Amino acid sequence: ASASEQETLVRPKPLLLKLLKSVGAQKDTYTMKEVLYYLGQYIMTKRLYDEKQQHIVHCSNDLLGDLFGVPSFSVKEHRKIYTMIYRNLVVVNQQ
């Protein structure tokens, strides 16, 4: 039913929802594009990167690390990022 992969509708699981809402997300249902956007807002506000290597997120002592299950990851490794995000949501229908 989704018009594109980025437009897949999802319901974040409770802790990922808590995380997204902490950075101004007002929804309960999001597109995958929106989840990436709000994760980005979270990383930027909490400064979860080293100014030296901006492509590496450091999250070992943060909820982001607990939910993704890693102490750090590369923003370039999209496959790994999708895998970690998917474990924290449920796919929903357009109704």
Ligand SMILES: CCC[C@H]1N(C(=O)c2cnccc2C(F)(F)F)CCC[C@@]1(Oc1csc(C(F)(F)F)c1)C(=O)N1CCN(c2ccccc2OCCCC(=O)O)CC1
């Ligand atoms: C490039 C300028 C915005 C990104 N930014 C920096 O890269 C950046 C800047 N200055 C200092 C430090 C950083 C740091 F984030 F990398 F640590 C700042 C925040 C928004 C920003 O990055 C991320 C959003 S969600 C995310 C993460 F959880 F880590 F995976 C990273 C961003 O919105 N995206 C767009 C989404 N990307 C992504 C990631 C995974 C899969 C597919 C992706 O993309 C597909 C195509 C885009 C589309 O979804 O339609 C990753 C980058």
